[PDB]
Amino acid sequence: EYPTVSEIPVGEVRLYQIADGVWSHIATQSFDGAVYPSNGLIVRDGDELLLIDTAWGAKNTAALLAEIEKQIGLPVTRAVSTHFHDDRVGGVDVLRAAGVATYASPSTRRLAEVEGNEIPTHSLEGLSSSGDAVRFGPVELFYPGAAHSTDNLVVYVPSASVLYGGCAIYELSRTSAGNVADADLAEWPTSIERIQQHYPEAQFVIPGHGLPGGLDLLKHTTNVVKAHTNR
Ligand SMILES: Cc1cnc(C(=O)O)n1Cc1ccccc1
Ligand SMILES: [Zn+2]
Numbered sequence: 768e769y770p771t772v773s774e775i776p777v778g779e780v781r782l783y784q785i786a787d788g789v790w791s792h793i794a795t796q797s798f799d800g801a802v803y804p805s806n807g808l809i810v811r812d813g814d815e816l817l818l819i820d821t822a823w824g825a826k827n828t829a830a831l832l833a834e835i836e837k838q839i840g841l842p843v844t845r846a847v848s849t850h851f852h853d854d855r856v857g858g859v860d861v862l863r864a865a866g867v868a869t870y871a872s873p874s875t876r877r878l879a880e881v882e883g884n885e886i887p888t889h890s891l892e893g894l895s896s897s898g899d900a901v902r903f904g905p906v907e908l909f910y911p912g913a914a915h916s917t918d919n920l921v922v923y924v925p926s927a928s929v930l931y932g933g934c935a936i937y938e939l940s941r942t943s944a945g946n947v948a949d950a951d952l953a954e955w956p957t958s959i960e961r962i963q964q965h966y967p968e969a970q971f972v973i974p975g976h977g978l979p980g981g982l983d984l985l986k987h988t989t990n991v992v993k994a995h996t997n998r
């Protein structure tokens with residue numbers, strides 16, 4: 768069963784095996800007097816590990832690596848951040864010290880230096896245009912357009928039919944659009960369309976925060992989004 772926010776103390780991290788060689792990592796943070804859960808992803812690449820997004824803060828990313836060691840005891844060598852926000856780059860310093868090579872798109876890199884967040888070192892080339900996809904070891908990287916942020920990336924794992932959609936994708940239980948200041952509300956739904964059309968074969972959909980479902984998470988997020996739009 769999936770770890771829920773009401774089951775994880777701020778400062779601990781859980782791993783949830785989704786397939787052979789595919790985990791998610793779950794963590795928690797307080798922010799504006801409330802507690803939220805956060806996801807990210809782990810994919811096995813032969814003998815190395817590929818880490819998708821941080822665990823929302825220095826401390827949690829330290830735990831995230833320690834729980835990787837306890838439970839998989841394979842090394843994390845590359846890290847991709849899927850947008851410039853703290854729940855995705857909070858802890859890039861802890862990874863880099865640990866000898867992890869951290870990556871993001873140049874748009875992510877720019878926006879992070881501007882917001883004062885931690886900056887992935889390497890720049891992922893070839894994703895600046897909506898629809899763009901590049902390979903990266905055991906996953907595909909996809910820029911669906913602007914959405915939750917202008918720079919947000921989705922990750923598909925083909926071996927396992929897994930779609931990591933990040934904060935661009937909401938969990939079902941989440942019916943309010945929240946704070947979406949960095950978002951393009953006008954393009955967000957077109958952007959989800961692109962996700963659907965490029966990965967219809969997805970069987971396991973992971974949001975930035977909360978419980979995983981399937982492609983129906985995309986109709987859901989289109990809906991919540993289009994209902995904010997119309998406030
Ligand atoms: C605080 C935070 C970080 N990332 C997000 C988001 O919407 O992606 N949010 C807002 C959020 C997250 C989870 C549940 C509700 C609101
Ligand atoms: Zn965000």
Ligand SMILES: [Zn+2]
Pocket residue numbers: 852854934975976
């Ligand atoms: Zn988020």
